[PDB]
């Protein structure tokens, strides 16, 4: 999973390096071809069949990169689904928490033993569910489970007192229950809430960065087809005028430097995705 993610971005970075090396080699060949200012047909049909090779390989590399990007998106979606499940479990635990608090209020406001017993029954069911509602060997996790064990034990004590008609002892047991709950489960609750908020923020920023990365790839792909169109609108037409030629000679330089700006942006985005993922 995480190791697979690290391997993907690693190999995506490697593909990026290969496509920037191929581009700079093509630029060097074009420069060395057109410094001499040779209008021979053989050199054009060969030193631009150099552009043809670069585009054939670079396009295959782009296809591999697109497949890797789709796999990366699938893994990110799996991570987001795991975070969604954890948030749902946290919501269930908070619901059980609210049930416990409501029934503690009811016990405080109660006057007879039947109301106390009913509230304690609801508390016991909520505490059992909350203990089970957890996604895992951290010390806080163990303290949470042990605290719910003690909490259900205190519910047992309060129920035992209530079944004997001792309402005041039941309220006292509920107060000790509140103290135990605060001392044991509150820290885990705070940690889970903080983790869920941080994960929501991370999800938002990763949705933004992935969108930017997909846009960068599609933009680079659009530049590549423009490169082929320009080369053969100039290749097959066997152009001869030097002014028409020079103009193209710059068009491609500006297109190549724009592709550089795009490729370095892709590199920095991939480095960002790695840092945020570890």
């Amino acid at each position, epitope marked *: 999973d995480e190791e697979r993610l690290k391997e993907i971005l690693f190999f995506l970075l490697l593909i990026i390096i290969f496509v920037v090396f191929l581009l700079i080699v093509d630029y060097k060949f074009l420069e060395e071809f057109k410094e001499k200012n040779v209008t021979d047909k053989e050199e054009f049909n060969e030193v631009i069949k150099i552009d043809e090779a670069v585009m054939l390989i670079s396009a295959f590399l782009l296809a591999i990169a697109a497949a890797l990007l789709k796999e990366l998106e699938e893994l990110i979606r799996k991570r987001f689904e795991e975070w969604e499940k954890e948030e749902e479990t946290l919501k269930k635990l908070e619901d059980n928490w609210e049930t416990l608090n409501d029934n503690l209020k009811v016990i405080e406001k109660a006057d007879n033993a039947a109301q106390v017993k009913d509230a304690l*029954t*609801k508390m*016991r*069911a909520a505490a*059992l569910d909350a203990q089970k509602a957890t996604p895992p060997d951290s010390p806080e996790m163990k303290d949470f489970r042990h605290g719910f064990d003690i909490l*259900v*034990g205190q519910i*047992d004590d309060a129920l*035992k007192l209530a079944n004997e008609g001792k309402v005041k002892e039941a309220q006292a047991a509920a107060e000790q229950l509140k103290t135990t709950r605060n001392a044991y489960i509150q820290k885990y609750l705070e940690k889970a809430k903080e983790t869920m908020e941080k994960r929501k923020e991370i999800r938002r920023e990763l949705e933004k960065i992935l969108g930017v990365l997909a846009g960068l790839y599609v933009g680079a792909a659009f530049l590549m087809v423009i490169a082929k169109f320009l080369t053969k609108k100039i290749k097959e037409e066997n152009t001869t005028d030097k002014e028409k030629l020079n103009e193209w000679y710059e068009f491609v330089y500006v297109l190549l430097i724009f592709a550089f700006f795009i490729i370095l942006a892709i590199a920095v985005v991939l480095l960002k995705l790695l840092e945020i993922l570890g």
Partner: antibody
Amino acid sequence: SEVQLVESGGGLVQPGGSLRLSCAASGFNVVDFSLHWVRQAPGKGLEWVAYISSSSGSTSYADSVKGRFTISADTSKNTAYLQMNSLRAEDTAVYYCARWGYWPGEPWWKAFDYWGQGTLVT
Amino acid sequence: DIQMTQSPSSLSASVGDRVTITCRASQSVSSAVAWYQQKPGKAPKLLIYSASSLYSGVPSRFSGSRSGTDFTLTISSLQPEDFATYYCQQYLYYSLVTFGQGTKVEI
């Protein structure tokens, strides 16, 4: 090395009478298991009658039988007793005695893992 | 007082037919629901506890599931020794024990 519960003392009795059912436990002691009495009327379903926790002395009763039955225990001889008083026509049933572990852990979650053979009361 | 409503009150099935028994709790009892099997003239024995945990020695065909206050017992392959009365029982607390009405699976 077999955990079992054996019921005794049940049988035919006149209405309004008194009898002490006994549940003797072997393979385990009472002090770490609450003992519950559960009755099944002829052709009906199961119904929980009472329980006793000898560790804390707590006893609880079904509403249909509260005030008439008295559940007690003797850990020295490892037995539970149910004194049935003021018997009526709806008290005829097969009475089973079951063990239930204490909170927390698997013993509590296993519920009535072992049941007695049950004795008939008429 | 927690009611534990069991359906159906009785079902007829043959050997191999999948059997499903459903129980509804009048209020949340967590997963503190157990399924017991009872033969005619014998004491109930524990099949499932914690509403999904299979007791030791029970064939793995028996299974239990929970969905809110609904609890389901499933016999995947009804064997000839699987005809009996099955009881859902909530055990939230010692004094709050209530049983289902019982489903009489017969061959």
